[PDB]
Amino acid sequence: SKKHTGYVGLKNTCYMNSLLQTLFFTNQLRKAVYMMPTEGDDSSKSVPLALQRVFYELQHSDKPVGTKKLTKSFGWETLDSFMQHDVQELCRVLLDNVENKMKGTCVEGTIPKLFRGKMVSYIQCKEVDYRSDRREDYYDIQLSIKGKKNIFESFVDYVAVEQLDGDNKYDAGEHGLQEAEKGVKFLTLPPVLHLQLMRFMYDPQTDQNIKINDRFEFPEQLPLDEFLQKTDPKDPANYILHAVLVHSGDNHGGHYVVYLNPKGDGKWCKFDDDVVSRCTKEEAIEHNYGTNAYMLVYIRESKLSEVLQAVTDHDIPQQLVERLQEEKRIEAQKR
Numbered sequence: 001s002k003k004h005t006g007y008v009g010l011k012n013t014c015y016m017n018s019l020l021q022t023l024f025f026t027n028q029l030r031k032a033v034y035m036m037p038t039e040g041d042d043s044s045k046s047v048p049l050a051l052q053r054v055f056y057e058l059q060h061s062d063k064p065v066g067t068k069k070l071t072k073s074f075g076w077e078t079l080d081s082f083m084q085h086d087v088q089e090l091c092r093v094l095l096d097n098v099e100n101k102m103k104g105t106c107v108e109g110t111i112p113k114l115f116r117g118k119m120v121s122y123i124q125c126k127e128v129d130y131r132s133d134r135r136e137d138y139y140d141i142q143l144s145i146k147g148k149k150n151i152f153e154s155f156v157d158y159v160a161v162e163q164l165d166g167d168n169k170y171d172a173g174e175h176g177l178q179e180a181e182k183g184v185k186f187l188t189l190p191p192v193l194h195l196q197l198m199r200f201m202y203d204p205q206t207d208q209n210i211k212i213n214d215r216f217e218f219p220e221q222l223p224l225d226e227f228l229q230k231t232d233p234k235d236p237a238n239y240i241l242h243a244v245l246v247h248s249g250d251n252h253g254g255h256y257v258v259y260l261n262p263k264g265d266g267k268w269c270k271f272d273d274d275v276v277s278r279c280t281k282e283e284a285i286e287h288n289y290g291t292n293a294y295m296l297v298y299i300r301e302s303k304l305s306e307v308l309q310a311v312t313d314h315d316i317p318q319q320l321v322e323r324l325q326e327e328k329r330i331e332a333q334k335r
């Protein structure tokens with residue numbers, strides 16, 4: 001309900017309602033979503049326009065906001081379509097559509113501005129002079145949590161140098177089968193940091209994946225300078241916790257909640273589909289360790305004013321407002 005919390009819920013679609021709120025309260029994205037030139041797009045088919053509708057209605061409605069038009073636009077209507085994919089794949093499906101629509105426009109490069117970081121995957125031979133680098137972009141990170149107490153330990157394990165010895169030695173081609181060091185190194189961390197946590201793993205004796213219900217800790221403030229190669233004293237890599245996406249119950253079904261800190265000000269709310277309610281820091285952060293938190297969103301402190309900048313009704317263009325109201329006037333009177 002809007003009167004208690006300030007915010008409205010979504011109506012049921014497993015992990016989408018959790019992600020849509022998370023992307024909506026990324027205010028700099030929301031503004032750019034409104035500036036997409038969707039006037040010459042079809043209503044039923046356009047994913048850009050459907051996300052504009054949800055964002056419009058989440059900003060403006062007092063009642064809960066529908067997602068049926070958005071599901072129909074990218075074809076994930078049934079339950080089995082949601083089950084096959086993960087949250088990062090859904091996030092990639094939404095944000096790629098938004099990025100491609102924003103190309104050749106005033107708000108181009110907004111997705112990579114907010115979400116795209118850079119890393120180097122490297123292989124160094126120990127006893128011969130051969131190094132092999134690849135610069136990769138990333139929009140999300142998938143962190144390991146099995147045998148890891150916290151995020152710091154998971155980032156250590158992410159960047160940990162694997163040795164290649166004995167059986168598994170590096171094929172250097174001309175130099176031959178060589179002993180070597182494999183690792184990954186973060187070059188930059190983006191303003192909005194989507195961190196998924198590896199709650200599933202492969203168990204050999206059952207021929208099937210199984211859930212990890214272990215206690216995993218994550219802080220409100222997250223320093224990550226030690227995980228970057230070349231730090232910046234003018235811009236430290238200190239990250240404020242923004243959202244926590246949570247699962248409960250069994251796998252084939254269950255319940256899907258997101259906790260959120262929409263202004264970056266420690267004032268937490270639980271978004272349980274249609275019922276949005278206030279909650280403590282401890283219900284959002286501490287109590288969702290081990291029920292399992294599966295994705296976390298961190299915003300960079302230096303970029304927090306820009307990322308969570310104030311949206312107004314003036315930031316939605318007139319043609320889009322006129323379009324979405326003309327739908328709602330026709331959609332009401334139909335009986």
Ligand SMILES: O=C([C@H]1Cc2cc(Cl)cc(-c3ccnc4cc([C@@](O)(CO)CCl)sc34)c2O1)N1CCNCC1
Nearest residue numbers: 015083085086087142196197198199200247251292294
């Ligand atoms: O079992 C489920 C249900 C029950 C359940 C429990 C838990 Cl604790 C998390 C998820 C979940 C939902 C969305 N995205 C993700 C991503 C995950 C990763 O671990 C692997 O990509 C991140 Cl590294 S877990 C997860 C979940 O979904 N499935 C079958 C497989 N796809 C989703 C639906």
Ligand SMILES: [Zn+2]
Nearest residue numbers: 091139140194
């Ligand atoms: Zn993402």
